[PDB]
Write a protein that binds this ligand. Sequence first.
Ligand SMILES: Nc1ncnc2c1ncn2[C@@H]1O[C@H](COP(=O)(O)OP(=O)(O)OP(=O)(O)O)[C@@H](O)[C@H]1O
Lengths: 197, 196, 224, 98, 110, 110
Amino acid sequence: PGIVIPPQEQITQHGSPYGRCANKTRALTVAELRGSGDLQEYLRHVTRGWSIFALYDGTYLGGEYGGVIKDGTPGGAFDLKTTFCIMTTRNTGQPATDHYYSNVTATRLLSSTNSRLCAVFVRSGQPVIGACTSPYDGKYWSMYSRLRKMLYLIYVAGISVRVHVSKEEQYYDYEDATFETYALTGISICNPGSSLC
Amino acid sequence: GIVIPPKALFTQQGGAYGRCPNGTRALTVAELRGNAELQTYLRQITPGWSIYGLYDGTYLGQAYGGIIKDAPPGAGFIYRETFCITTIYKTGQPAADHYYSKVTATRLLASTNSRLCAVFVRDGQSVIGACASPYEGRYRDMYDALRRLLYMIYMSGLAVRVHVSKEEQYYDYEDATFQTYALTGISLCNPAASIC
Amino acid sequence: DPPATVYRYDSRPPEDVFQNGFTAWGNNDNVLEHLTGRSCQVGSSNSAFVSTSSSRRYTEVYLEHRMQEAVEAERAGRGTGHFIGYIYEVRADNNFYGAASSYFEYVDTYGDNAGRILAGALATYQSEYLAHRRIPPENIRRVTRVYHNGITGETTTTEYSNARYVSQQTRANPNPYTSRRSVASIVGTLVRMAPVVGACMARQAESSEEAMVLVYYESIAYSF
Amino acid sequence: LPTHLYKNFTVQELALKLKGKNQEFCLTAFMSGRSLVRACLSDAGHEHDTWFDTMLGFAISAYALKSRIALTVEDSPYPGTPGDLLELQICPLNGYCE
Amino acid sequence: DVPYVLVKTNMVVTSVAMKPYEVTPTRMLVCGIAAKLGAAASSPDAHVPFCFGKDLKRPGSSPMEVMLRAVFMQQRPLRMFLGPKQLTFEGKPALELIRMVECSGKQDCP
Amino acid sequence: DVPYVLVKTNMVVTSVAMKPYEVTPTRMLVCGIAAKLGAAASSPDAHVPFCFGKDLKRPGSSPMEVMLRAVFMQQRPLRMFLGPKQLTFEGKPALELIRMVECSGKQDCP
Ligand SMILES: Nc1ncnc2c1ncn2[C@@H]1O[C@H](COP(=O)(O)OP(=O)(O)OP(=O)(O)O)[C@@H](O)[C@H]1O
């Protein structure tokens, strides 16, 4: 409950074999399909036969089966011939204004082939925002070489920073995310109120 | 028994006043003493009353007869002609992989536009030497990655299995009792994984 | 074979050490917080362990650098280049236990995620042995005293021997020290820079004769 | 060009942010007696120069090592505007810059 | 290779390494050995060797490198999507790593 | 500029500094303060300023650079080959460091 749900268009035109969702895309969860009406529909009107598909942590008995969402196990049904992959990048279309979150602490690192490096910035248990960096694609690729250095520093040190994100792009890399996740664009080991934050 | 750089390595144009051009290294006396033909060659090429400087000693031209005279480090540098060896030698051996387990990295060594080396050590013994340069060599391109792990294992205990390509031999360290080759791989020791 | 003789660098003199020896900072005997530096930090020093090392050369190079420091302090008009350091020699009993082993064993009781890669690389580095509780006079044998005058450039070695020293026929414990998993929060391994020294070592030495800069090995062991 | 040099200050704040089409990192240098010295370095919106990177990584070590540093700003043409880090120096670890 | 991608949870990277790409002068691998918390020394999941390519023509560290460095250092449990392809690390086949995510809890790491 | 290469033994790197290379802007200077381990406060070799050029065109740390970083954090005794040329560091000149090897012991470092 309270999971960011991928917008219908994040789905890809064809599912992937051997469980190998393609690069820059990732398997859909049981919990995400469920929460997404638009998706369920899509699958229903596009799935023929007595077909069963692999979702990250479960199975989708489509076609003649009705459109059933069976709870599974992480990757445990990757033997099926097709897994449902979602794309991870979304051009939000919002304006590139600055958004910052103070007192945050980079945690839960995520990476993937030819994609982006992300972290979940928490604040007293509770997550707050997710942010990512990637030299590969992205409005802000330039800042990768510079960001990865501060990110790694604060990560292994536990340095309570103040993170800045540009909502111009949205990423769905994490699974069942209680938090949103945008493009990282700055970090600051900061003094309260500092003109430098 | 010090590794004796081969005569072939000898720089026809030695460095002036102890400044052997990047890529080369001043030849020591111990090396010159043990290098038969390099010496013979020397007689055949030093016009009398000419003194050439080595790392330690000096070479009294064949007028004095050709004498390897000891001397402090950098001392012989006072003269205009210094003896140097280029530090890379193409072994011409096959490009196969050889490794040394349970070693530790020590004794870093850097030149200007040449390599970064380290002497790998097992229980006191200097097992092997390995180098990596972003300037010349086969694994020329693997430098930027290797340096990062060389730097880590150096900076912490961390034993290791080092992978070396006897393909090319390096003579960067002076008077060595271990051989040095091109570094191609590092693998932190892991018993369980049957690595070290 | 467990070492018989260990060493301890210190800013304390023989007239003190030879009578009272060293007696642990506190009861916290958790092997991880120690090697990790937690139980030897400001407002947190409680290690029931006296840090010593089985390698004299180690203590040697540390003192040799603490001295070069004095020389550089004076150069900045911050001192008089003078330094006096000691290197006590100790007879180890079963009350002495290896730092590394202690580390490894902990990790194989609570699993990989409970330890720290560098905390274990460090124990093996400083060749540390943990004196449980205290290391008393009878175990303290000799003592090299190093004096250096940074201004003359002259070094002056000097030895002394403890009368109270007692000759037993011991060696360190052949068995790993053991403690309940740390419920403490540990960020990394606290270490003093140049040369890299564990916090419980570098820290324990300094006494009554400006805070020590303890850093996270993890933040510096790898480039940026 | 009213340059200046500060010795024996510690890096207290470090921040990489975006500034228009240029990135820009800044540090705050602090000495118990004085006010904060503050400087920034920004990619000239120009390529090649490993410069920005090189200095950022250096300033990150100064921050990480908790060492006293000796910096050289170049005074901003406007007040309340930090200057430029012209060069940075890491004093002897555990000690002071002479 | 393996038939399908394996997802493994509670893996702790315990060794790391680099080697050349056994077939490409333009790539190289960054390998490791991961272990699943609680397994038996006997258990296969006690030391899963992996590797991922690195492009020797694009200067820097990849997003996956930065992370391995970090989680190896702090000994952080991972969910790794190893497979389905295989590469050789230390004269033995090792599963390619295509994605890894730090475990935040038993929920995401069963 | 000095007239001939000087080999200094038993020195430790005491302070590092980054600076723009006065001349070409494709280069910068990596300068330092080397000081013979143990020497006298006033001893000549108690404060030997050196520099070496960095190519801002090439990415990454040069071999010299990776060493200067390692020996300066660990304070390792070296053998530096200084001069003959001289760069500027702090108004006063500075010898160009051109090679450095660590010391195995007295045999190589007296
Ligand atoms: N403490 C230090 N002492 C000396 N040189 C340092 C120190 N910290 C960093 N350097 C150098 O400053 C420069 C930048 O270092 P940094 O770690 O930021 O990037 P890098 O090492 O070049 O690697 P990358 O390619 O990942 O940026 C190089 O000269 C790096 O070796």
